[PDB]
Amino acid sequence: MENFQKVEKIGEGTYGVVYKARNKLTGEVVALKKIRSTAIREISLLKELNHPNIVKLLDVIHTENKLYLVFEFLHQDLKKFMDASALTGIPLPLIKSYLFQLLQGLAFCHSHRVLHRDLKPQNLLINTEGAIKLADFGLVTLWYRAPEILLGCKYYSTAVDIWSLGCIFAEMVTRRALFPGDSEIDQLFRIFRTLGTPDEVVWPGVTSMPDYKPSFPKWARQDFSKVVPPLDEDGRSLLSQMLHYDPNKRISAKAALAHPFFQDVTKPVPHLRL
Numbered sequence: 001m002e003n004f005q006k007v008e009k010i011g012e013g014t015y016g017v018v019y020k021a022r023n024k025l026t027g028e029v030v031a032l033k034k035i036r037s038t039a040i041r042e043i044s045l046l047k048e049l050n051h052p053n054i055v056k057l058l059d060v061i062h063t064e065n066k067l068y069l070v071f072e073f074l075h076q077d078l079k080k081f082m083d084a085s086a087l088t089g090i091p092l093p094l095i096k097s098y099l100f101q102l103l104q105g106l107a108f109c110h111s112h113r114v115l116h117r118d119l120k121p122q123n124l125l126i127n128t129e130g131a132i133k134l135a136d137f138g139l140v141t142l143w144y145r146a147p148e149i150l151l152g153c154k155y156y157s158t159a160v161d162i163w164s165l166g167c168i169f170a171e172m173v174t175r176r177a178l179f180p181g182d183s184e185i186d187q188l189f190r191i192f193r194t195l196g197t198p199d200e201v202v203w204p205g206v207t208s209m210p211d212y213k214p215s216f217p218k219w220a221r222q223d224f225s226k227v228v229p230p231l232d233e234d235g236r237s238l239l240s241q242m243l244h245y246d247p248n249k250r251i252s253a254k255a256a257l258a259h260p261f262f263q264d265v266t267k268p269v270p271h272l273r274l
């Protein structure tokens with residue numbers, strides 16, 4: 001840690017504080033995440049998980065019970081790009097590129113039995129060359145949380161990351177968050193008002209989950225034509241399969257890569273002001 005000089009504070013999360021820093025031996029610019037056993041073991045297995053659409057973990061430094069993670073540095077996150085793109089909107093061929101790349105990253109991690117668990121725009125990082133990357137994997141916001149987690153399930157699957165990415169796809173298209181809940185119950189009821197209250201017809205087993213109550217209000221489903229209007233029929237069809245209630249029926253990352261929405265995918269470059 002005597003090897004690194006802090007340049008500036010980037011920002012914060014639940015776990016820690018992030019700084020831009022410079023390595024005095026290599027000259028290199030990096031990102032440094034500061035946190036105040038089995039944990040060390042599992043974090044260290046991530047040093048071995050390398051893919052062009054995952055932010056690289058360079059090292060783990062454990063000194064005096066403080067833990068520091070050293071990452072490759074990118075110049076902007078997706079939340080800042082969306083805010084700056086607000087009056088014009090992100091062009092459709094760039095939205096489609098970013099979605100395709102993120103599904104490549106997920107298909108890779110899910111084949112090694114690794115889950116992200118906290119996907120949101122602040123955890124997605126971009127560069128000037130047109131790439132987008134998954135960042136800062138989990139071992140605060142409720143807006144991107146899957147319904148099986150909110151209903152109390154303890155042994156949830158890779159399917160929770162597909163739900164989150166669907167919520168993010170809709171947000172890029174409309175320029176507003178899809179389900180902006182402000183407590184656990186408000187998050188759940190916001191999903192139910194849009195997609196309909198789930199029952200045994202659409203999700204076998206749902207009434208037996210730990211936090212399910214027979215007194216939930218009964219709301220009717222709405223058409224996806226009203227949920228994401230500017231999107232074509234191929235894109236609406238894919239989004240609908242990423243937001244199915246039953247996690248066994250929800251589309252996998254590998255299957256989604258084969259959907260007809262990606263028949264004409266390209267790689268455009270963004271306009272960034274750094």
Ligand SMILES: CC(C)c1cnc(Nc2ccc(S(N)(=O)=O)cc2)s1
Nearest residue numbers: 031071072073074075076077080135
């Ligand atoms: C910790 C790690 C995953 C990061 C790597 N590179 C980072 N860079 C970074 C740059 C700019 C912005 S922001 N909010 O757009 O000004 C946010 C993050 S964070």
